[PDB]
Design an enzyme around this catalytic site. Structure first.
Site, PDB file in Angstrom:
ATOM      1  N   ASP A 116       0.873  -1.168   0.000  1.00 20.87           N
ATOM      2  CA  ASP A 116       0.000   0.000   0.000  1.00 20.87           C
ATOM      3  C   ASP A 116       0.912   1.221   0.000  1.00 20.87           C
ATOM      4  O   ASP A 116       1.898   1.251   0.738  1.00 20.87           O
ATOM      5  CB  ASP A 116      -0.867   0.014   1.263  1.00 20.87           C
ATOM      6  CG  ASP A 116      -1.603  -1.292   1.475  1.00 20.87           C
ATOM      7  OD1 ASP A 116      -2.557  -1.573   0.718  1.00 20.87           O
ATOM      8  OD2 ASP A 116      -1.216  -2.049   2.397  1.00 20.87           O
ATOM      9  N   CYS A 135      -7.084  -2.423  -6.447  1.00 22.39           N
ATOM     10  CA  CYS A 135      -6.091  -2.594  -5.395  1.00 22.39           C
ATOM     11  C   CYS A 135      -6.951  -2.553  -4.134  1.00 22.39           C
ATOM     12  O   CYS A 135      -7.924  -3.304  -4.038  1.00 22.39           O
ATOM     13  CB  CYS A 135      -5.047  -1.466  -5.412  1.00 22.39           C
ATOM     14  SG  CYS A 135      -5.599   0.168  -5.971  1.00 22.39           S
ATOM     15  N   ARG A 137      -2.207   2.109  -6.646  1.00 16.86           N
ATOM     16  CA  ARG A 137      -1.561   1.081  -7.447  1.00 16.86           C
ATOM     17  C   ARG A 137      -2.274   0.883  -8.785  1.00 16.86           C
ATOM     18  O   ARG A 137      -1.625   0.781  -9.827  1.00 16.86           O
ATOM     19  CB  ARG A 137      -1.504  -0.239  -6.656  1.00 16.86           C
ATOM     20  CG  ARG A 137      -0.451  -0.230  -5.535  1.00 16.86           C
ATOM     21  CD  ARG A 137      -0.693  -1.292  -4.442  1.00 16.86           C
ATOM     22  NE  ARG A 137      -1.810  -0.928  -3.570  1.00 16.86           N
ATOM     23  CZ  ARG A 137      -2.125  -1.560  -2.440  1.00 16.86           C
ATOM     24  NH1 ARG A 137      -1.410  -2.599  -2.026  1.00 16.86           N
ATOM     25  NH2 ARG A 137      -3.169  -1.158  -1.725  1.00 16.86           N
ATOM     26  N   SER A 138      -3.600   0.851  -8.768  1.00 18.30           N
ATOM     27  CA  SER A 138      -4.334   0.655 -10.012  1.00 18.30           C
ATOM     28  C   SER A 138      -4.143   1.855 -10.937  1.00 18.30           C
ATOM     29  O   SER A 138      -4.110   1.704 -12.158  1.00 18.30           O
ATOM     30  CB  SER A 138      -5.823   0.414  -9.734  1.00 18.30           C
ATOM     31  OG  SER A 138      -6.461   1.608  -9.322  1.00 18.30           O
ATOM     32  N   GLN A 194      -1.017   7.747  -5.850  1.00 14.26           N
ATOM     33  CA  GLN A 194      -1.100   8.310  -4.505  1.00 14.26           C
ATOM     34  C   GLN A 194       0.151   8.874  -3.843  1.00 14.26           C
ATOM     35  O   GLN A 194       0.066   9.438  -2.750  1.00 14.26           O
ATOM     36  CB  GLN A 194      -1.727   7.258  -3.589  1.00 14.26           C
ATOM     37  CG  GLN A 194      -3.205   7.079  -3.824  1.00 14.26           C
ATOM     38  CD  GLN A 194      -4.005   8.125  -3.089  1.00 14.26           C
ATOM     39  OE1 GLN A 194      -4.072   8.100  -1.861  1.00 14.26           O
ATOM     40  NE2 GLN A 194      -4.599   9.062  -3.825  1.00 14.26           N
TER      41      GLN A 194
HETATM   42  O1  LIG Z   1     -10.787   8.887  11.895  1.00 16.25           O
HETATM   43  P1  LIG Z   1     -10.058   7.831  10.897  1.00 16.25           P
HETATM   44  O2  LIG Z   1      -8.447   7.997  10.995  1.00 16.25           O
HETATM   45  O3  LIG Z   1     -10.475   6.319  11.327  1.00 16.25           O
HETATM   46  C1  LIG Z   1     -10.631   8.146   9.095  1.00 16.25           C
HETATM   47  F1  LIG Z   1     -11.758   8.081   9.042  1.00 16.25           F
HETATM   48  F2  LIG Z   1     -10.227   9.638   9.016  1.00 16.25           F
HETATM   49  C2  LIG Z   1     -10.205   7.667   7.995  1.00 16.25           C
HETATM   50  C3  LIG Z   1     -10.919   7.868   6.784  1.00 16.25           C
HETATM   51  C4  LIG Z   1     -10.383   7.426   5.575  1.00 16.25           C
HETATM   52  C5  LIG Z   1      -9.135   6.784   5.551  1.00 16.25           C
HETATM   53  C6  LIG Z   1      -8.733   6.086   4.411  1.00 16.25           C
HETATM   54  C7  LIG Z   1      -8.630   6.727   3.180  1.00 16.25           C
HETATM   55  C8  LIG Z   1      -8.254   6.031   2.035  1.00 16.25           C
HETATM   56  C9  LIG Z   1      -7.025   5.388   2.042  1.00 16.25           C
HETATM   57  C10 LIG Z   1      -6.582   4.661   0.959  1.00 16.25           C
HETATM   58  C11 LIG Z   1      -6.102   5.361  -0.150  1.00 16.25           C
HETATM   59  C12 LIG Z   1      -5.185   4.783  -1.021  1.00 16.25           C
HETATM   60  C13 LIG Z   1      -4.722   3.489  -0.800  1.00 16.25           C
HETATM   61  C14 LIG Z   1      -3.952   2.913  -1.652  1.00 16.25           C
HETATM   62  F3  LIG Z   1      -3.221   4.080  -2.361  1.00 16.25           F
HETATM   63  F4  LIG Z   1      -3.174   2.344  -1.038  1.00 16.25           F
HETATM   64  P2  LIG Z   1      -4.394   1.929  -3.210  1.00 16.25           P
HETATM   65  O4  LIG Z   1      -3.074   1.533  -4.032  1.00 16.25           O
HETATM   66  O5  LIG Z   1      -5.194   0.643  -2.750  1.00 16.25           O
HETATM   67  O6  LIG Z   1      -5.319   2.861  -4.124  1.00 16.25           O
HETATM   68  C15 LIG Z   1      -5.211   2.785   0.310  1.00 16.25           C
HETATM   69  C16 LIG Z   1      -6.136   3.359   1.190  1.00 16.25           C
HETATM   70  C17 LIG Z   1      -8.435   6.589   6.744  1.00 16.25           C
HETATM   71  C18 LIG Z   1      -8.963   7.025   7.958  1.00 16.25           C
END
Ligand SMILES: O=P(O)(O)C(F)(F)c1ccc(CCCCc2ccc(C(F)(F)P(=O)(O)O)cc2)cc1
EC number: 3.1.3.48
Length: 297
Positions: free
Chosen positions: A180, A214, A220-221, A261
């Protein structure tokens, strides 16, 4: 040439600045449907939603929503569907989409479990004697076979519309060592994988768009699709150095938010496209070189 520009950016350490310029110039369109209270449990992340104008619609009278976007690249002549990693309650939706869109291949770039937290649901069968049935969408999935490699696994699956009893062979390409917010190991490993997907014929216009995902379906995608589209473009306009990767990425973000990202994944995208250009313009051995360096055995 492309190498000189890449080197200039590296020298001045401007990758983070280029990446930031991209986030600021990126398109912003409404995502009303994704935000409806009833679709709250169909989204893996709060601030990652498909634009209303390009979201994939499920052919079901109940709720046609799925967190997926259709990326249509006009000039490159190729479409991709980017989606999040299926949740426990959307696996049926996921496969329903694969069927309705007539996809031939599915590309998975994350792992069901990364560093503890469940980054994705086990939406495909791990053992042939254990087929899966999705009652909500009336679909059946069977593992026919799989070719395991050091950093990626290719699976042959049979998807059956239990309603009409029609059968389809789906190819699953699972890249297993892409963390990730991280990058692949070397351009050779990435390109070796990308060309595996290409040669399978899964990305042919004769089939529906390949489904790529992903965890969130943007980092990643986004990297995978950007590299593929750019290699497609510099083989089409036969003047590779004119292909502006940053602009191609902005064109893509018009269909789904946050593609790519990190500043590092952007840099990798350039490295992968530059390395991949060698093939697109002559060398017919560098592919074996990639397979060699990838250490897939
Ligand atoms: O209060 P809290 O802290 O619980 C929270 F709500 F604010 C909270 C809300 C949203 C998030 C996650 C946001 C997306 C993350 C995501 C983006 C990209 C990738 C990837 F880039 F890795 P990918 O390659 O799979 O696209 C993975 C995950 C975290 C915490």
């Amino acid at each position: 040439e492309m190498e000189k520009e890449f080197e200039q950016i590296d020298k001045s350490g401007s990758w983070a600045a280029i990446y930031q310029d991209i986030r600021h110039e990126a398109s912003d369109f409404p995502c009303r449907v994704a935000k409806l209270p009833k679709n709250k449990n169909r989204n893996r992340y709060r601030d990652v939603s498909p634009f209303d104008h390009s979201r994939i619609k499920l052919h079901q009278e109940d709720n046609d929503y799925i967190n997926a976007s259709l990326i249509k690249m006009e000039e490159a002549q190729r479409s991709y569907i980017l989606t999040q990693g299926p949740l426990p309650n959307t696996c049926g939706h996921f496969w329903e989409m694969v069927w309705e869109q007539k996809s031939r291949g599915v590309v998975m770039l994350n792992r069901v479990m990364e560093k503890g937290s469940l980054k994705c649901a086990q939406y495909w069968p791990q053992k042939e004697e254990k087929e899966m049935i999705f009652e909500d969408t009336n679909l059946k999935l069977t593992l026919i076979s799989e070719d395991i490699k050091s950093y990626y696994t290719v699976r042959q699956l049979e998807l059956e519309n239990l309603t009409t009893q029609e059968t389809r062979e789906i190819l699953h390409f699972h890249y297993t060592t892409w963390p990730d917010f991280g990058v692949p190991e070397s351009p050779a490993s990435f390109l070796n994988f990308l060309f595996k997907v290409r040669e399978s014929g899964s990305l042919s216009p004769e089939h529906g768009p390949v489904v790529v995902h992903c965890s969130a379906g943007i980092g990643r995608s986004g990297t995978f699709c950007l590299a593929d589209t750019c290699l497609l473009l510099m083989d089409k306009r036969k003047d590779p150095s004119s292909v502006d990767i940053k602009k191609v990425l902005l064109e893509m973000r018009k269909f789904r938010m946050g593609l790519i990202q990190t500043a590092d994944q952007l840099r990798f995208s350039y490295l992968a496209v530059i390395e991949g250009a060698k093939f697109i313009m002559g060398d017919s051995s560098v592919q074996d070189q990639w397979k060699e360096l990838s250490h897939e055995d």
